[PDB]
Amino acid sequence: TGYDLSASTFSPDGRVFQVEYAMKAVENSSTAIGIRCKDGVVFGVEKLVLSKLYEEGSNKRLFNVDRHVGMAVAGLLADARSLADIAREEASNFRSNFGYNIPLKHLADRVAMYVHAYTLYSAVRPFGCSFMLGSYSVNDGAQLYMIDPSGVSYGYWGCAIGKARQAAKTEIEKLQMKEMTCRDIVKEVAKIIYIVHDEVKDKAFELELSWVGELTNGRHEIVPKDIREEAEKYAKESLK
Amino acid sequence: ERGYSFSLTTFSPSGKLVQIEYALAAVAGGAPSVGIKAANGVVLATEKKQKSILYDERSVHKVEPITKHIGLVYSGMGPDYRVLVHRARKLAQQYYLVYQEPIPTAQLVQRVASVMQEYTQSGGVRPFGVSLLICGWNEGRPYLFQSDPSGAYFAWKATAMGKNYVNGKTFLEKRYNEDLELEDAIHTAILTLKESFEGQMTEDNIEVGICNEAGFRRLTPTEVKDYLAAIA
Amino acid sequence: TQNPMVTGTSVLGVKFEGGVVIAADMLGSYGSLARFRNISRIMRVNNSTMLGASGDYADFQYLKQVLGQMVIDEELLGDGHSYSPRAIHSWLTRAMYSRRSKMNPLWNTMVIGGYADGESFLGYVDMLGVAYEAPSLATGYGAYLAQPLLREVLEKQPVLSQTEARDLVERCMRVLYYRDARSYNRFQIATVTEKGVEIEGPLSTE
Amino acid sequence: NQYDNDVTVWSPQGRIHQIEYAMEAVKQGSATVGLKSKTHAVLVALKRAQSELAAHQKKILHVDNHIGISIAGLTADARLLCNFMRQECLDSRFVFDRPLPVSRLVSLIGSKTQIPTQRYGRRPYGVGLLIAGYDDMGPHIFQTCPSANYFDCRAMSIGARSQSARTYLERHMSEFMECNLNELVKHGLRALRETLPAEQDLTTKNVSIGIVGKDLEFTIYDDDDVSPFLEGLEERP
Amino acid sequence: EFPMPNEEARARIMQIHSRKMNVSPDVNYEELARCTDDFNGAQCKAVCVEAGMIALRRGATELTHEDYMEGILEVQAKKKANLQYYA
Amino acid sequence: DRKIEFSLPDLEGRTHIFKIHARSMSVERDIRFELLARLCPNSTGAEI
Amino acid sequence: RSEYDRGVNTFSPEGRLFQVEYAIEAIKLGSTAIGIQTSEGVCLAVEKRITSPLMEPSSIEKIVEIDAHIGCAMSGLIKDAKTLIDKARVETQNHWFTYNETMTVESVTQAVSNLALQFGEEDSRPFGVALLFGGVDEKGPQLFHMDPSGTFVQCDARAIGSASEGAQSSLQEVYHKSMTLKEAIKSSLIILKQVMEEKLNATNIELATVQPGQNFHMFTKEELEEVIKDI
Amino acid sequence: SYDRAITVFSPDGHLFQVEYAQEAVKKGSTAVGVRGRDIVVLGVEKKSVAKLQDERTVRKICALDDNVCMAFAGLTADARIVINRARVECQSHRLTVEDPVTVEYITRYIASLKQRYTQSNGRRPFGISALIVGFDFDGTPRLYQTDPSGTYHAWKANAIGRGAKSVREFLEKNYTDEAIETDDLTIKLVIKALLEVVQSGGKNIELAVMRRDQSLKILNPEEIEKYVVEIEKEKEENE
Amino acid sequence: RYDSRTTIFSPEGRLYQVEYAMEAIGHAGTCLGILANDGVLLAAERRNIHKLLDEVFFSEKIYKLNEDMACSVAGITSDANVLTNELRLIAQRYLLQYQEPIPCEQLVTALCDIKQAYTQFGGKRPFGVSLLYIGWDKHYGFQLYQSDPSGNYGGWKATCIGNNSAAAVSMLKQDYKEGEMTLKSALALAIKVLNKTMDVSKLSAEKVEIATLTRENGKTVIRVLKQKEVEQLIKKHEEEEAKAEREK
Amino acid sequence: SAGFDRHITIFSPEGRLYQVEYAFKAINQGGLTSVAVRGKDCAVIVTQKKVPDKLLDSSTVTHLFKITENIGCVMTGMTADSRSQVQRARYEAANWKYKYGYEIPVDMLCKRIADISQVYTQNAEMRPLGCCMILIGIDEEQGPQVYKCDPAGYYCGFKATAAGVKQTESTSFLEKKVKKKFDWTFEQTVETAITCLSTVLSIDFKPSEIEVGVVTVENPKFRILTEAEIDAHLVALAE
């Protein structure tokens, strides 16, 4: 109280409270897990359909930052969409001024700097959405970076953002992402997401998958519906 | 009147710019500095103590030159002193370029005071928490001025700023004679630092600068050692 | 762009039932000298549209980066909508007309042709912004030499075939080689149909 | 509490309360139903008259030939968003000569609304827009709540007493797809009529109907024009 | 520790205290729970009772969702009017 | 259970209050109570 | 409310902007103005509310000529009313200049609302004035009402000012679609006398009419007595 | 808690800061202005300046243009700025349109400047109410009062500053067509009206008299002395 | 309260910040100026008289603005310096545009307008500097003008601002002979006033600064009295006091 | 006293800026410790490498950032602000090279960094960057140099130093060590730094928990010691 009304006021013990509040806000949303294959990066987000009137694909949380970069925002959807727009702008500017696809590391660093610049001013508030960036390139392998409201962003072999981040990590650490390919890893992602789901507190959800790697010629595209069901079939096979 | 001790752009009922007084207190709560003006030259001395033996005493110098014949010693917040010294150097060089003559101590001091006052007129800008003490030798007459965060400048003959400034001022008016010389002025300044100096005065802990007709120059540890041994 | 440095030859294109075909040389002639001879003057924008232009290749190259990012953004949204060949044409017309108004126009006479929803599109926006729809278009000299020929084939028979289109341009660029001082005997052919846009080449002549 | 003044202050629980209040701003307006069949996107709105002898307030606005909206919220923000969408549609027509996609316009609206919810200086756009349009992918019925989040809905309904319309639309979602213009309009009118209290009835002076279809440009039906659709509606039980 | 009821908690409370009353199967208790943020269990029961009483006012044999919303408005003494600027 | 808010009377409420408190007063027959109600913008029944 | 009503940028729990309603309340402190729209034309009757006999009666402006065919009635803050009226005049002149035609009353009301809408949209406070626009256009006689919130809606016979509620209630009873200008004016004067603190005469009311063919005619001193004679 | 910001509306729709600013006008020396058939008068009270200060720099009646003069109340600091801006506006209006600035136009510009200063924070309202009077109508006398709020009004005779209520009450009950039929009687009316507010001797009333197609004539103390002698004679006749 | 910022008006209609500044002007050292038939003069009190302070300018309170103007100061040091710099800039700008000296009142009005602008626009604190003006112009000759923090100036024949301004002004009113004061008599009256305006007895020459404006052969020479003549005047006043007490 | 610690530009009653001290304390939020030791011909810095998750990528967590091939930095404290300051330092070094030719000396580099921080602290616009910036780098004519320069804007020359949660203990250990004049060799410098960190943290210092960076006169290029070199140095330290 008193030191937590603005993002530019350091707490007496040395902690910017608004950033922690944004982290809590992102913690208040659904789970989104990114798992790095041996030859790609797979994104999976549990997209809760708040009402039956939605169009099975509305407000999807999987965004294509660029051709090779996939983003798996989870949290305040408006902030996530704004961040996706800024990431696309940065990717376009990097390609125009340098001529080659912006490396996932550099794009993540620039977007993280942009996010952190919004937790330093009193006239702006920290982004309430945490996002993970994924891409594949033979030149630089598959990279999966997660940037939260605080602005910190280091690479991950596999990360989960949302309500059941800890539950997702418990059953993701039990997966060998070092060697597996992006074919069975999709089924693993579907199963892990289905495990981390209340199903009594959340009425229903529409699993949406995504991947980028060698199997997709290096580009990031929505997982084909033909094989997406196979992942859904495996998840259903898993009892939870 | 606790209600008006916050903003620098509002007048207290008695008519006191509270923030300026608080900045002056912060200045007086800094490192000691004493300067004496002799008929031949000027002397500037500040106590340079680092919190541990792990600090390179030579990396940061409290006494810095503004031009070939202007000096600077401070007592208060050093980071503010760095910007103050940068502005002073820029002002001196602008005056030199416009007039092709080394900026007189009076004019450089006045412009530094104006720079200081520039920050004490709008909300959102903290007054400079350092009071500068300027040496000089222009037109063959030693000069010593002190510029404060309030923007006022004086012509101190000899004064000590920072911690234990009352004791330094009391020591002055006693060992100060208006007809001294540069060496005697240096000795008096070293003694004045001593009476407000905690611990041994090593060559690396006290930094002094003579600013006579020859110009301003920071005495190297060797000369400071010789002077302290002579006094000791 | 006030004094072109590297320029381009004519650009030819004739529309047939089922798609459109364009071709262009690969001779970047700084002044009268063949500065470069392995450049591509016809690159695709999307699966159902392709373009190629004359004039400053640097100015056109700038257009390549603009369209690529401008085109690439189209599929990033993943909404299904893609810039129709008219859509790119309309953007181009305002793109150069806006640039010309500020005395810095792109000295790059473009031609954009594509196949969309069962109809072919063949537009040409000149270095200044003029643009129209014709069954067959040739940039620069091609208007003088190849363009007159294409009316004769279209006037008597406005319907053409891919092979008839293939040699027609060849009989079009061949005459370009004979009566032109800036042509080159290495050109690409761009074919756009339902199957997509394909670029192949080069090709020579006797 | 004290985290209830600005959009740039984060509540301890993780909510920007000002966004919640902007969202609540929608319910102060009249109920509006927007729904889409295979070829048509019809949205029916209820018009409220300030006085008995005052023209009923306009609720269905015109944006472009293929993009219609229903405003359920602040008149100021509703009109501002309508003007911005009109400008975006005109720019798309001028530069591309092609109808600006409804999805892209909705995304632009969301992006523009997000900024007021992230930077101090102006309140969030307290208007809920039901965007209906026809493009290459068929009819689209979006809802753009003040929270800067838009939902692509088959048949949405915002405004005061809008829960009944939403429930009816959920019940009859199946028939919406394979329905003609008349049946779509009648289902929308039934959804609106469910929202009204027992005493009030769907009269020709307080219903506005907007339709965009395969070959039909946007049309706003007010007063007698609604009569052909209104007649034949089953009397409420 | 007893916390202020959550969304599921408020919905369950409304369901428990609306059992004895003739309630329309069209009521969306989740929407009511969303609309009653910062409501304790006693306030939720008051919302249900006020919805019932309001339904009685109109002579409606069976409660309706709008009646529940009006009861939610009445529970905190709030009054909703047709503002001349929210159209 | 029920929190009744006794807001300041509206114009109709003020007119009715004026009639209620003026029922016994020997007032003339042309007294426009509507004007007196409109001239008391925010006044309770006690002020009436 | 005390913490949420100190700026048009703050949203109340209801979602209400607790500064525009204060603007409406401010408009509630002005002199009553009445406008009746009939097939023959549009009539505007108001209350002078003269404060001193020394003040020039024409100095205080309640009905002004926004254009030759559209009249405006003011009720509320003088400064906001003057600024909005000047903006309406400028907008009408601009429309005439660019389009060589008389802007419709709906168009002029939209133009004035646009300025009444920038109540803090980053290019101050809501314009605390309500304007009753009356005139004849290609659609016939019309009357439009505006509130500080920027909401404008066509009104057949709207009353705004101190006596808005009673004047409107009586207008509902005394208004029909088939009224002529003479009867509409008589009814408006009767209503104003009913809701007027001071006895009606020629020095406390200014009556304005705008009929098709003819221009905005503001009844002069001699004219007003002729109409008040019978009422 | 609604009186600490200009752009904040009170629950009853009051812009309280402007009302407070008018209080500043309520604290100034009284100014009385009455316009005749061929004369416009601006009454003023002198404040009995200190024994050891010069009254040349305390000018309260100043002319914006060659034929328009204004007498103000309230704080002098704002009145001087308003007067300077009015002069610059009159000289700019003459420049753009050769026709001399009308009294109505100068009053409108003063009101516009005041309103612009009372429209947003960081700009304190002008606490001076100006009585602008001038024959600028080219054959018609006009008098205006610009309130600190920003609204102006045409007044046959109005009072501003301390005692404005009493002077206005006197003017209402004495300003009749027979009263101002001649310039001398108009000046006598001004003196009589200002006498009830300022009970004192000579030099306590400064009268600015402007005739048709003429210049301002700040009456010397003797002329005011002559008029007060005449008024005393009239009172003696009444008794 | 209603003193959070200058722009705020009190219910009675008083700029509380401006009044606070005009009250705070009393903390400044005493300065006064007497207008004489042949010229005008200024008197100031050096509050800081420490032995370790070197007098380098001799004009801490009295500044030269133009070749025919000078203005004493009283108030904040930074505000005083800014105001004097702006005064010099305004005077020289007027000289450049019109090629004649500013008629004194023009400079006073310009400075007062600047101060008024500061006291009006929000985010700026009122200039707590009240400075007396002296000078000669072809229009009115010798004049003395008083400037307050509120921008309200005014012609004055003899005024004192700062410490005990009320007593000095009152006893100048008591013993100022209008139109019969010569520069010598003006200096005598100024010394007499300064003697009791300050608590320090004997009116030390080093503790008082006097500057006089004279009109010599069309040059308008501004002269700051040297310590010798100040001591002579102090001794003259002492002898006059002894003569007066002789009656006792 | 406590009411002045909500804005960075407000001075405390005793002459203190509370927000700068608060940022200094926030430096410790990362829970890490970093130490720099300046040898006779080398400069070595070791910082903790905490990876409390099996799914993290240890290669992307390194806190040792290379500002330039000749100058080095180790950010301690808040991660995001530390990375922002590292990017700003890289920009400053690049601009110095572009505008003056010769590589910017480390002292100048983060003197510019500290001036940026101070300008942040003076004008209340942005929260001060809560991350201590420790710089190393061989400078011609001045041997190895390590400079720590912090949020408030203070930069000094250091023979040895440390920033983080365990700063006082590490500095006391260094003072106990720096005093027994001895051959400050590359191996000796690395061993002393690692020993100080181990004693302060009281940890066995597994090779994957530390990250070291050394700049030497013989090889004046920032080099991040790999796991093998760190393990060899640790084994030499043990025996």
- Here the CATH number for the domain that contains residue A93 is 3.60.20.10
Whole-number Å distance between alpha carbons of I221 and I203: 26
For chain E, how many residues are written?
87
Whole-number Å distance between alpha carbons of D149 and D129: 11
Question: What CATH number labels J1-239?
Answer: 3.60.20.10
Verify cis geometry, omega within 30 degrees of 0, for the bond prior to H11: no
Whole-number Å distance between alpha carbons of D123 and G10: 6
Q: What share of chain H is helix, strand, coil (3-state, %, to 5)?
A: 40, 20, 40
- Select from G6, G23, G56 the Cβ nearest to the Cβ of H155: G56
CA torsion angle for E83, E86, F4, F6 (degrees, to 10)?
-30
Contact of G88 with G116, CB cutoff 8 Å: no
- Give Cα A156 to chain centroid, integer Å: 11
Secondary structure of chain I as H, E, C letters = CCCCCCCCCCCCCCCHHHHHHHHHHHHCCCEEEEEECCEEEEEEECCCCCCCECCCCCCCCEEEEECCEEEECCECHHHHHHHHHHHHHHHHHHHHHHCCCCCCHHHHHHHHHHHHHHHHECCCCCCCECCEEEEEECCCEEEEEECCCCCCCEEECEEEECCCHHHHHHHHHHHCCCCCCCHHHHHHHHHHHHHHHCCCCCCCHHHEEEEEEECCCCCCEEEECCHHHHHHHHHHHHHHHHHHHHCC
* Contact: C73, A67; criterion CB under 8 Å: no
Q: DSSP string covering H126-180, please?
A: P---EEEEE-TTTS--EEEEE-SSS-EEEBSEEEESTTHHHHHHHHHHH--TTTT
Strands A153-155 and H217-218 turn out to be unpaired
Give Cβ neighbours of residue I20 (< 8 Å, ≥ 6 apart).
B11, B12, B13, B15, I3
Three-state secondary-structure class, residue B37: strand
Whole-number Å distance between alpha carbons of D50 and H117: 35
Distances (CA, A) of B224 to B34, B73, B205, B231: 15, 16, 10, 11
Give the method of determination: cryo-EM
* Contact: G55, H155; criterion CB under 8 Å: yes
- Give Cα D218 to chain centroid, integer Å: 14
Residues 10-39 of E with CB under 8 A from D: 26, 28, 31, 37
Per DSSP, A71 falls in state E
**CA neighbor of C75 nearest in space, from B89, I99, A63:** A63
Resolution for this experimental structure (Å): 3.0
**CA neighbor of I33 nearest in space, from I147, I117, I145:** I145
Contact of H21 with H127, CB cutoff 8 Å: yes
Domain residue ranges in chain J: 1-239
Torsion B62-B65-B66-B71 (CA) sign: positive
- Select from A4, A25, A124 the Cβ nearest to the Cβ of D8: A124
Mutation for testing the H interface, residue in G2, G9, G12, G52 having most H CBs under 10 Å: G52
Distances (CA, A) of C3 to C31, C129, H13, J29: 11, 18, 66, 60
Provide the shortest C-alpha distance from residue D68 to chain G (in Å).
20
Three-state secondary-structure class, residue H103: helix
Whole-number Å distance between alpha carbons of I101 and I99: 7
Whether C1 is catalytic is: yes
* Contact: A64, C65; criterion CB under 8 Å: no
Q: Catalytic one among C1, C49, C139, C191?
A: C1
Q: Is J151 left (phi over 0), alpha (psi -120 to 50) or beta?
A: alpha
CA torsion angle for I69, I73, I79, I83 (degrees, to 10)?
-10
Whole-number Å distance between alpha carbons of B69 and B215: 4
CA angle B68, B70, B75 (to 5 degrees): 135
Largest Cα separation within chain C, whole Å, is 49
- Select from E46, E76, E79 the Cβ nearest to the Cβ of F1: E46
Give the H-side interface with G, CB within 8 Å: 1-2, 5, 7-15, 111, 115, 118-120, 144, 149-158, 168, 171-172, 175
* Contact: H81, I123; criterion CB under 8 Å: no
User: Helices marked H in chain G — which ranges?
Assistant: 20-27, 78-99, 105-117, 164-174, 181-194, 221-228
Give Cβ neighbours of residue G100 (< 8 Å, ≥ 6 apart).
none
Strands H61-65 and H217-218 turn out to be unpaired
**CA neighbor of C45 nearest in space, from C192, C162, C169:** C192
**CA neighbor of E87 nearest in space, from G33, D123, A78, D54:** D54
Whole-number Å distance between alpha carbons of D97 and D121: 36
Contact of B134 with B144, CB cutoff 8 Å: yes
Strands H142-146 and H152-154 turn out to be antiparallel
* Contact: I9, H51; criterion CB under 8 Å: no
| 3+ Cβ–Cβ pairs closer than 8 Å linking G and A | no
Domains parsed from chain D with CATH numbers: 1-234 (3.60.20.10)
* Contact: I81, B173; criterion CB under 8 Å: no
Mutation for testing the G interface, residue in E69, E75, E80, E84 having most G CBs under 10 Å: E84
Give Cβ neighbours of residue H201 (< 8 Å, ≥ 6 apart).
none
Whole-number Å distance between alpha carbons of H149 and H129: 9
Distances (CA, A) of I100 to I66, I69, I73, I96: 11, 13, 25, 8
Enumerate neighbours of B (3 or more CB pairs within 8 A).
Answer: I, J
* Contact: E80, G14; criterion CB under 8 Å: yes
Place of tokens 């006045």: B110
Whole-number Å distance between alpha carbons of A211 and A44: 9
F25 near E CB under 8 A: no
| Kind plus residue range of the DSSP H or E element containing B109 | helix B105-118
> Both tokens of residue B37?
């003006």
Say how many Å lie between the first and final Cα of chain B, rounded: 49
CATH code where residue B103 lies: 3.60.20.10
Place of tokens 């039909």: D216
> Both tokens of residue C29?
């002639």
Per DSSP, D45 falls in state E
Whole-number Å distance between alpha carbons of A17 and A7: 7
**CA neighbor of J158 nearest in space, from J145, J142, J140, J176:** J145
**Strand ranges inside chain A, DSSP E:** 32-37, 40-48, 62-64, 69-72, 74-75, 129-137, 141-147, 153-155, 158-161, 205-213, 220-222
Mutation for testing the E interface, residue in G1, G8, G12, G14 having most E CBs under 10 Å: G14
Looking at chain C, which residue has its C-alpha nearest residue D95?
C91
10 Å CB burial of residue E57 (0-12, 13-18, 19+) is exposed
Give Cβ neighbours of residue E1 (< 8 Å, ≥ 6 apart).
none
D53 near G CB under 8 A: yes
For chain J, how many residues are written?
239
Q: Is J214 left (phi over 0), alpha (psi -120 to 50) or beta?
A: beta
Torsion I167-I170-I173-I174 (CA) sign: negative
- Select from A9, A116, A152 the Cβ nearest to the Cβ of J6: A9
CB atoms within 10 A of CB B216: 25
The one-letter code for the residue type at C111 is V
Domain residue ranges in chain C: 1-206
Place of tokens 């067959």: C136
> Both tokens of residue C153?
């084939």
CATH code where residue I158 lies: 3.60.20.10
G chain contacts of residue H168, beta-carbon cutoff 8 Å = 52, 54
CB atoms within 10 A of CB A136: 29
Q: DSSP string covering C75-108, please?
A: HHS-SS----HHHHHHHHHHHHHHHHTTT-----
E chain contacts of residue D163, beta-carbon cutoff 8 Å = 28, 31, 65-66, 69
Whole-number Å distance between alpha carbons of D147 and A209: 26
* Contact: I120, H55; criterion CB under 8 Å: no
C chain contacts of residue A92, beta-carbon cutoff 8 Å = 69, 72-73
Number of domains in chain B: 1
H chain contacts of residue G2, beta-carbon cutoff 8 Å = 1
Contact of G59 with H104, CB cutoff 8 Å: no
CB atoms within 10 A of CB F36: 15
Provide the shortest C-alpha distance from residue G120 to chain H (in Å).
11
C chain contacts of residue A95, beta-carbon cutoff 8 Å = 65, 69
> Both tokens of residue H109?
């510009």
Per DSSP, G179 falls in state -
Whole-number Å distance between alpha carbons of B99 and A217: 69
Half-sphere exposure of D181 (CA within 13 A, CB side): 12
| Kind plus residue range of the DSSP H or E element containing A21 | helix A17-27
**CA neighbor of I61 nearest in space, from I82, I42, I86:** I42
Strand order in the sheet with J155-158: B55-56, J155-158, J143-149, J131-139, J72-77, J64-65
Three-state secondary-structure class, residue G66: strand
Number of domains in chain A: 1
CA angle D134, D138, D143 (to 5 degrees): 65
- Torsion angles phi and psi, residue B189, rounded to 5: -65, -40
Q: DSSP string covering C110-135, please?
A: EEEEEEETTEEEEEEE-TTS-EEE-S
Whole-number Å distance between alpha carbons of I151 and I109: 8
Contact of J138 with J216, CB cutoff 8 Å: yes
Looking at chain F, which residue has its C-alpha nearest residue G166?
F34
Half-sphere exposure of C115 (CA within 13 A, CB side): 21
**CA neighbor of J218 nearest in space, from J178, J194, J182, J187:** J187
Enumerate neighbours of I (3 or more CB pairs within 8 A).
Answer: B, H
Give the I-side interface with B, CB within 8 Å: 1, 3-6, 17, 20-21, 23-27, 48, 51-57, 76-78, 81-82, 85, 123-126, 128
For chain C, how many residues are written?
206
- Select from G28, G29, G197 the Cβ nearest to the Cβ of F35: G197
> Both tokens of residue H227?
């008029």
Contact of B36 with I54, CB cutoff 8 Å: no
Provide the shortest C-alpha distance from residue D177 to chain E (in Å).
23
Strand partners, A143: A135
Domain of residue B226 covers: 2-231
Whole-number Å distance between alpha carbons of I112 and I108: 6
Give the C-side interface with D, CB within 8 Å: 77, 79-81, 83-84, 86-87, 89-91, 94
Contact of H30 with H197, CB cutoff 8 Å: yes
Contact of H128 with H82, CB cutoff 8 Å: yes
G195 near F CB under 8 A: yes
For chain A, how many residues are written?
240
Give Cβ neighbours of residue B16 (< 8 Å, ≥ 6 apart).
I24
Mutation for testing the A interface, residue in C61, C64, C69, C75 having most A CBs under 10 Å: C69
B chain contacts of residue I63, beta-carbon cutoff 8 Å = none
Whole-number Å distance between alpha carbons of A106 and A90: 10
Per DSSP, A143 falls in state E
Contact of C197 with C48, CB cutoff 8 Å: yes
Per DSSP, B7 falls in state -
Distances (CA, A) of B193 to B157, D124, I50, I162: 16, 62, 21, 38
Size of interface E-F (CB pairs under 8 A): 11
J153 near A CB under 8 A: no
Whole-number Å distance between alpha carbons of H125 and H146: 13
Torsion G71-G75-G80-G82 (CA) sign: positive
E49 near F CB under 8 A: yes
Contact of C17 with C160, CB cutoff 8 Å: yes
Provide the shortest C-alpha distance from residue B11 to chain I (in Å).
6
Contact of H76 with G40, CB cutoff 8 Å: no
Size of interface A-J (CB pairs under 8 A): 97
Number of domains in chain I: 1
- Torsion angles phi and psi, residue D94, rounded to 5: -70, -40
Half-sphere exposure of A201 (CA within 13 A, CB side): 11
The one-letter code for the residue type at A18 is Q
Three-state secondary-structure class, residue E29: helix
* Contact: D101, C94; criterion CB under 8 Å: no
Whole-number Å distance between alpha carbons of F25 and B185: 100
10 Å CB burial of residue H4 (0-12, 13-18, 19+) is middle
Distances (CA, A) of F47 to F15, F16, H216, J121, J235: 13, 14, 54, 58, 94
Contact of B97 with B51, CB cutoff 8 Å: no
Strand partners, C97: none
Domain of residue A195 covers: 1-238
10 Å CB burial of residue A25 (0-12, 13-18, 19+) is buried
Largest Cα separation within chain D, whole Å, is 54
Q: DSSP string covering D182-233, please?
A: HHHHHHHHHHHHHHS-SS----TTSEEEEEE-SS---EEE-GGGGHHHHTTP
**CA neighbor of H58 nearest in space, from H203, H211, H188:** H203
Residues 91-130 of D with CB under 8 A from A: 107, 110-111, 113-115, 117-121
Whole-number Å distance between alpha carbons of D117 and D16: 9
Assigned fold of C1-206: Glutamine Phosphoribosylpyrophosphate, subunit 1, domain 1 (3.60.20)
Contacts by D151-154, CB closer than 8 A, 24 or more apart = D151/A50, D151/A51, D151/A54, D151/A55, D151/A58, D151/A59, D152/A54, D152/A55, D152/A57, D152/A58, D152/A59, D152/D103, D152/D106, D153/A51, D153/A53, D153/A54, D153/A55, D153/A58, D153/D34, D154/A53, D154/A54, D154/A55, D154/D35, D154/D36
Three-state secondary-structure class, residue J163: strand
Domain of residue I10 covers: 1-246
| 3+ Cβ–Cβ pairs closer than 8 Å linking J and A | yes
Three-state secondary-structure class, residue D103: helix
The one-letter code for the residue type at G44 is L
> Both tokens of residue D200?
């009030």
Contact of H194 with H71, CB cutoff 8 Å: no
**CA neighbor of A186 nearest in space, from A164, A215, A162:** A215
- Torsion angles phi and psi, residue C177, rounded to 5: -65, -45
Contact of G165 with G154, CB cutoff 8 Å: no
CA torsion angle for B166, B168, B173, B174 (degrees, to 10)?
120
Contact of G230 with G190, CB cutoff 8 Å: no
Whole-number Å distance between alpha carbons of I111 and I90: 8
